[model samples]
Target: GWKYFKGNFYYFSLIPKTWYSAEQFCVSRNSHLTSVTSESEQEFLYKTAGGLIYWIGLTKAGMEGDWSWVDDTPFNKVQSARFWIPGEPNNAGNNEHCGNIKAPSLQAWNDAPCDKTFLFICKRPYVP
Candidate 1:
């Protein structure tokens, strides 16, 4: 099952899939990948995700080195205390463009080409 936080306007899916596929799936539902806002939120997602590697909304597209969330929001601060693997933002051989969360094991982040498939979380403002 997947849930989208109303207050923060973030979406999450328990189903495991691929990055590009997941993005398409989310788009079908008028949403995009989840964006982390705080340590508590990240921790919540880490626990909710269990051991599944899910994609988030952050990516380095359009801009070569700048990172932005799915909502096109520029991340100005580090909400979580964790860090990516060394030389991670290097785009990993220039083939990496998407981000995924690995937890209950590594819990670290890795970047891969957007074409790569992986389960992902999406987000959109609730329209009530």
Candidate 2:
């Protein structure tokens, strides 16, 4: 098998857009906004993310209360901790639904409005 990280890259753009639009950007390239499922993968981002808070592949989806990955799956064991800044996913005024990782490497997460503009992360499988 090949290495694990060979396929994923965290994208940072000074040109920002609402989370949905940003996600659309990744999809256009045959990828999706990033999905962090493990601590090792999370730590990798903890060390590498370069700008301010960046979009990730998570949301409350349609329930407006249930947390799940972009694929509409439940949170796996590694992510059951909520990984968020704690007290997060509060939906903050019932407006925040998109997930993001704040910069400076705290590895902390927070939920924000889907329409808020910010840089984002996208991941695609490596065919090589």
Candidate 3:
């Protein structure tokens, strides 16, 4: 539900919200949805999320298959190789463009619809 590890801080939402709402929630906190960029960070998110399906900052949004993290990093290598569950980003139903870390998917990444309501991960830079 909460975390401060390796110079990164994470806050897991208690109430569920749609993907866009989750994104807005983070913005209101002067943060952004968590970006799990590396295997260790991704694993950290998985464990810290407390096994809940939570939204992240990655999204295709209006970019279609060209998903990008909130930090503006392109979602490619790290996406297919480690984070996303296989067959994901499949753009299921043409509306699954937002990203989530789902427990059912073994804490792996999945593309969900923007309107899908769920808890989200908010992140801020850790201040030492």
Candidate 4:
């Protein structure tokens, strides 16, 4: 199940698929997994996801060590205060290339393969 912030749109499906597959699915609808820009946004997402680790618009494939948003926004120095698991973002195991936000207890982040499937959050510029 997935829902968009600031919109009545919602999607719930029993079909399970990989991250890339899910991303592609969302793209077809003019969106992709969501990107986080602030703590309030993160809180909203956690509430929506309901304890599921979901994909976001983040990866290090094209350029390892350089993280960027799906929208191609340069990774800003926002002073990420949360603590990540030690040795993480190591692109560890050579298998974890993408990133996801763990929920119900939003703390830090973890790197995982995009091929691994999980629920996702998608976002569009707020138009008001």
Q: Global lDDT of each model?
A: 0.67, 0.71, 0.78, 0.62
Q: For residues 1-128, could you state the per-residue lDDT of candidate 4 as single tens digits?
A: 34555552434324546767766776786666666666666677666667677776676635536666675656553544352334556676687767776645446467788788776665654345
Deviation in Å, model 4, residue 68 alpha carbon: 1.5
Model 3 lDDT on a 0 to 1 scale: 0.78
Q: Which candidate would rank higher by lDDT, 2 or 4? A: 2
Off by over 4 Å in 1: 4-18, 77-87, 105-107
RMSD of each: 3.1, 3.7, 2.3, 3.2
Model 4: how far is 60 from its true place, Å? 1.0
Question: What lDDT tens digits, residue by residue, belong to model 1 across residues 14-127?
Answer: 566677677777888887777776656676666767777778876775654667677676675364336354545557677777787765433356677777666677777677
Please provide, for model 3 over 46-101, each residue's C-alpha lDDT reduced to its tens digit, 9 standing for 90 to 100: 87776779998878735336777875656665444567777876888988878998
Assess the local accuracy of residue 53 in candidate 1 as a C-alpha lDDT between 0 and 100. Answer: 74
Off by over 4 Å in 3: 61-64, 74-80, 104-107
What TM-scores do the predictions have?
Answer: 0.74, 0.81, 0.85, 0.74
Ranking 2 against 3 by TM-score, winner: 3
Colliding pairs, model 3: none
As a whole number from 0 to 100, the lDDT of residue 11 in candidate 1 is: 57
Q: For residue 128, what is the lDDT in candidate 1?
A: 75
